[PDB]
Amino acid sequence: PQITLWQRPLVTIKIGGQLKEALLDTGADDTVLEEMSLPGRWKPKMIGGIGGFIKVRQYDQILIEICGHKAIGTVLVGPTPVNIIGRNLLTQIGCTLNF
Amino acid sequence: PQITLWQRPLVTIKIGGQLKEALLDTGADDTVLEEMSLPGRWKPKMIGGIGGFIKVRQYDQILIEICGHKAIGTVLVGPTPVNIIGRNLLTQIGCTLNF
Numbered sequence: 344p345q346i347t348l349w350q351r352p353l354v355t356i357k358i359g360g361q362l363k364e365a366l367l368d369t370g371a372d373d374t375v376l377e378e379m380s381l382p383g384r385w386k387p388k389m390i391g392g393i394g395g396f397i398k399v400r401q402y403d404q405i406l407i408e409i410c411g412h413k414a415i416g417t418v419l420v421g422p423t424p425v426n427i428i429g430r431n432l433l434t435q436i437g438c439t440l441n442f
Numbered sequence: 443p444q445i446t447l448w449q450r451p452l453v454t455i456k457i458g459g460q461l462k463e464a465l466l467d468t469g470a471d472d473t474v475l476e477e478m479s480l481p482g483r484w485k486p487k488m489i490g491g492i493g494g495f496i497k498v499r500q501y502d503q504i505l506i507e508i509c510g511h512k513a514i515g516t517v518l519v520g521p522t523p524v525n526i527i528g529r530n531l532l533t534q535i536g537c538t539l540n541f
């Protein structure tokens with residue numbers, strides 16, 4: 344769809360059996376999601392952001408359905424305020440920026 | 443133009459007679475630039491990102507030329523890593539998300 348930006352660009356995702364709303368973020372390289380129950384093994388990592396750095400669990404090859412399109416990639420689960428869908432997955436569902 | 447997302451969406455802005463480069467961020471509600479010499483009166487404000495909170499100087503009514511397009515808005519200048527063009531200016535240059 345075409346999404347104008349007079350409101351936050353949130354979209355429903357289906358991840359690990361659960362339904363969530365995540366923000367479409369072109370300024371984020373990675374997908375970072377708030378703490379939730381995910382199947383499997385993971386590696387600790389520390390991602391940087393504007394207020395500093397947070398420690399996250401890294402899950403690779405996690406299937407996620409962003410507004411009906413399916414994608415498989417790495418998801419970082421941690422202390423994020425909002426669920427962030429970053430550029431490693433937006434490229435997969437074919438998303439572009441236009442002006 | 444149309445921007446795909448395999449690389450960061452960085453564009454050239456002209457602000458306060460200085461040439462800068464900045465991230466086109468759909469996920470940010472506000473625009474926040476690195477520390478710079480800018481004339482005027484500003485107000486103390488503090489914003490959040492992941493990792494936490496930074497104190498910034500907010501300035502209203504500043505002209506920014508984002509890839510040639512002129513826009514007048516609120517710009518926050520402070521200790522950010524990258525310069526971020528958030529939704530208050532992105533709606534002015536007509537930017538939309540497509541997929």
Ligand SMILES: COC(=O)[C@@H](NC(=O)[C@@H](NC(=O)[C@H](C)N1CCC([C@H](C)NC(=O)[C@H](C)N)=C[C@@H](Cc2ccccc2)C1)C(C)C)C(C)C
Pocket residue numbers: 368370371372373375390391392393424425427429467469470471472474489490491492523524526528
């Ligand atoms: C560096 O690796 C990454 O890709 C990280 N990327 C970033 O932090 C990048 N920035 C962003 O994604 C943008 C600017 N953004 C940060 C500030 C930001 C805006 C400026 N904050 C606000 O408007 C608050 C509500 N006043 C929102 C972030 C999402 C969010 C929402 C609510 C509370 C906290 C965070 C998203 C830059 C620093 C490379 C991910 C952790 C998101």
